[PDB]
Amino acid sequence: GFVRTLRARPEAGGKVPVFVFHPAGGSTVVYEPLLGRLPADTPMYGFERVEGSIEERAQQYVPKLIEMQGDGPYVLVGWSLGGVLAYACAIGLRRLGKDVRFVGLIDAVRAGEEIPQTKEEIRKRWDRYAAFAEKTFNVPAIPYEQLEELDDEGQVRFVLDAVSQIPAGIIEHQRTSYLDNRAIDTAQIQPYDGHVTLYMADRYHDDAIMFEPRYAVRQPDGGWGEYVSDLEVVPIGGEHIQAIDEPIIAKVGEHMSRALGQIEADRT
Ligand SMILES: CCOC(=O)c1c(-c2ccccc2)oc2ccc(O)c(CN3CCCC3)c12
């Protein structure tokens, strides 16, 4: 289904599992280096891509989380889109009376300026995209009227259909990566009253900034302060793309290992 077992929990008992959520355009295999930097016998399960708005995705994840972990305690972690997903699940779990003890955002940083969801923005985005298409491929008027009334999924299907009028593996990977990135853009963040740990790199990587220049700037709280009063930021430096890998992930893992140790002691 959509649950990957990175490290299975014992048949009974054992430590609290870490649930990780996939990043934009990738799977949860990317959390293996993190897993290497967490305490021994820490179980880990990864939740992979599902369809819908952030809230719709969480509506699919949360029942599964509960089936696997019951009342809690819940440790929810994510890099890239995975961060927003972990957070949405945190809100859903807390609303149903569950015990969420840790939410780990791994450089899941909001654009430094809000990205509006307006028809003007739709037009600016696709104008930007058309221009790069011209330059990258050495190659007309953009049918804005039809695009404005399509959602993101509809917009890319329209552009891809108009394009064919490229092999499927490549189209599918560009498609889901594009939609997962837009899901980050259009996420409507709700407030959460539990503790959030935000691991913060210095900047988005250049390719990220080229697609959406508002990611060139980040606030110090990464845009989460207004939604999260109990917010901790753990600066890790480097770029967004590097935050998930060795050696920077060692810094994340060392800190996160301390948090897990406290959760384990409290149960004891
Ligand atoms: C090379 C990295 O490309 C992307 O980040 C994005 C992609 C993408 C497309 C095809 C293949 C891979 C990625 O689509 C986007 C749509 C909106 C948007 O704001 C972003 C920018 N990101 C950066 C921070 C979150 C949004 C992207």
Side-chain angles (χ1 to χ4, degrees), residues 1-10 12-113 115-133 136-144 146-152 154-157 159 162 167-170 172-209 211-268:
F2 55 76
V3 174
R4 179 181 311 264
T5 303
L6 286 301
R7 180 186 284 141
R9 75 196 311 169
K15 289 177 179 161
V16 176
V18 180
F19 296 101
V20 298
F21 298 75
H22 78 94
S27 79
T28 62
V29 297
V30 308
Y31 297 95
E32 290 272 11
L34 176 61
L35 181 59
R37 293 287 190 170
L38 297 185
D41 300 312
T42 301
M44 187 178 274
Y45 301 84
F47 282 48
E48 304 292 353
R49 185 172 305 100
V50 302
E51 303 305 320
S53 63
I54 300 288
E55 288 70 31
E56 290 177 314
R57 301 196 193 197
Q59 278 168 355
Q60 298 165 256
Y61 291 153
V62 164
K64 192 56 161 165
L65 283 159
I66 293 173
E67 177 190 4
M68 299 180 62
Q69 184 55 10
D71 284 317
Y74 289 93
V75 174
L76 310 169
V77 165
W79 168 61
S80 169
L81 171 60
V84 178
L85 298 173
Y87 185 91
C89 291
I91 290 172
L93 289 165
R94 187 181 167 111
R95 194 172 288 149
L96 293 168
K98 307 308 172 180
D99 173 37
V100 190
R101 300 274 193 84
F102 188 89
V103 176
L105 311 176
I106 303 178
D107 205 56
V109 172
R110 313 301 297 164
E113 159 183 328
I115 300 161
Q117 297 188 241
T118 65
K119 285 151 115 180
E120 179 70 355
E121 265 310 306
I122 300 179
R123 298 171 60 110
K124 280 187 191 219
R125 189 187 324 132
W126 284 103
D127 284 333
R128 201 158 59 249
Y129 294 172
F132 290 126
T136 300
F137 296 106
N138 266 28
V139 45
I142 309 184
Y144 307 105
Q146 288 98 66
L147 288 179
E148 295 176 341
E149 311 287 3
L150 302 174
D151 57 27
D152 285 296
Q155 289 172 29
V156 296
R157 182 67 66 182
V159 171
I170 289 180
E172 171 63 12
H173 184 259
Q174 295 289 107
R175 194 185 72 87
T176 59
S177 294
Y178 174 83
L179 297 172
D180 281 354
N181 274 276
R182 286 289 295 142
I184 305 182
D185 292 0
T186 55
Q188 296 302 278
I189 308 301
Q190 306 288 112
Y192 174 69
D193 282 334
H195 189 73
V196 175
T197 299
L198 171 60
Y199 299 93
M200 187 133 191
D202 291 337
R203 58 183 184 281
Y204 274 103
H205 52 307
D206 292 330
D207 284 341
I209 293 168
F211 263 86
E212 173 50 73
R214 291 172 184 99
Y215 284 108
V217 178
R218 40 177 64 191
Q219 304 302 331
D221 69 347
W224 290 92
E226 54 170 340
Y227 309 107
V228 182
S229 64
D230 189 13
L231 179 61
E232 179 195 14
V233 165
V234 178
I236 58 185
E239 310 187 1
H240 178 81
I241 190 71
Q242 299 165 316
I244 189 73
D245 286 317
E246 294 280 347
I248 290 170
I249 199 52
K251 211 169 180 322
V252 174
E254 195 270 354
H255 177 271
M256 188 180 296
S257 290
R258 292 194 304 259
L260 295 170
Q262 186 65 68
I263 297 176
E264 292 301 341
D266 291 5
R267 278 193 318 157
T268 310

